[PDB]
Amino acid sequence: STGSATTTPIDSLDDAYITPVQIGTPAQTLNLDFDTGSSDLWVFSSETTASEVDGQTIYTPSKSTTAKLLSGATWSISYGDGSSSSGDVYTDTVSVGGLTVTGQAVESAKKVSSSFTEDSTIDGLLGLAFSTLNTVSPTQQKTFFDNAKASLDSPVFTADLGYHAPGTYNFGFIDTTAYTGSITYTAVSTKQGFWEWTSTGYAVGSGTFKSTSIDGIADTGTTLLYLPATVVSAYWAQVSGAKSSSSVGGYVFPCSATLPSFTFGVGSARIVIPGDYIDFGPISTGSSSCFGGIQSSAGIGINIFGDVALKAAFVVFNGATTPTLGFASK
User: Fold this and answer.
1) Can you give the CATH number for the domain in which 47 is found?
2) 248, 232 in Cβ contact below 8 A?
3) Which of 174, 201, 229 is the last residue of a domain?
4) Do 194 and 313 have their domain in common?
5) Are residues 79 and 206 in the same domain?
6) For residues 3 and 5, what is the distance between their CA atoms, to the nearest angstrom?
7) What are phi and psi of 42, to 5 degrees?
8) Which of 199, 261, 296, 297 is catalytic?
9) Count of beta carbons in the 10 Å neighbourhood of residue 322
């Protein structure tokens, strides 16, 4: 089997992407944030504290003839941005782009933090990291991909995120029309539960490539590219007037700037992030200070190849017995 679903930016900055997901019988379609940096499929629901729901579409398990309470199971998650959610668990039928999993754990939120409430466009998350990170207790649950894997034509999914445009998540096949040139595959460590890999270096604009190993995670659920402070300083040094602002929370730059590209290495291959992908616009409405899309990972504890990086590539998440990651230009 295979599946193919379009993913759509939630706003004009590509702050996140939502993908429609069918849950239950009859189908309830919710728009979920597919997150290769976590492993829980959770939704706003009829159980979510009413004051914490503001515009989201909810899953109502009592209206699904295939929903079953997973008795005694609870979940609770905290994300790198400080947001969180928790609740109980149902199993139900879940379909993405025509690919159906029966008995998927659907984690129903009883509580969500303010950032979730305040984002009316995201109805929940669909985790695509390794199932070892799943937070359900006392019986850990599998991700949608893990459950689907054996049925797929090939044990893979691909992320093809757009810049200021829709893109595609495919399951079970590689669309050879969706990228240019060849796909370069690189080793993955699953030791921390992430799609963790090592970039071979970087370049700023038309500058020379610096060969250096940068361990990080491919994370569709993180907006920006978070890299070591040395790398990030070298990038922003090429932008007149750019500076790190403790008050704003990262590097800012004059909105009048033209940003240089940023290149990262995948083996001997190179992925080029155009300068415009690195512009996250005014820090506040009407400001002439703009927020940068490349930020320091110092104090996160891990480097993160988030959407800024991934949307410059066609990315293969290869879930074979020994997982790997592939990157192609597009």
Assistant:
1) 2.40.70.10
2) no
3) 174
4) yes
5) no
6) 7
7) -125, 150
8) 199
9) 9
Domain boundary among 174, 197, 225: 174
Q: Are residues 93 and 168 in the same domain?
A: yes
C-alpha to C-alpha distance for 201 and 199, rounded to whole angstroms: 6
Q: Which domain covers residue 226, as residue numbers?
A: 175-330
Q: Which residues contact 127 (CB under 8 A, 6 or more apart)?
A: 35, 38, 39, 40, 41, 133, 134, 143, 144
Tell me: do 139 and 216 sit in the same domain. Answer: no
Do the strands 262-266 and 17-23 form a parallel or antiparallel pair, or are they unpaired?
unpaired
Bond preceding residue 228 cis, omega within 30 of 0 = no
H or E element: which one contains 90? strand 84-96
Distance (Å, whole) CA 144 – CA 139: 16
- Residue 119 a catalytic site member: no
Which of 35, 92, 146, 219 does the annotation list as catalytic? 35
Both 113 and 205 in one domain: the answer is no
The gap between the terminal CA atoms of the chain, to the nearest Å, is 25
Distance CA 214, CA 231 (A): 10
- What Cα–Cα distance (Å) separates residue 284 from each residue in 119, 163, 238, 255, 287? 17, 22, 24, 12, 6
Q: Which pair of tokens denotes residue 8?
A: 């759509």
92 is catalytic: no
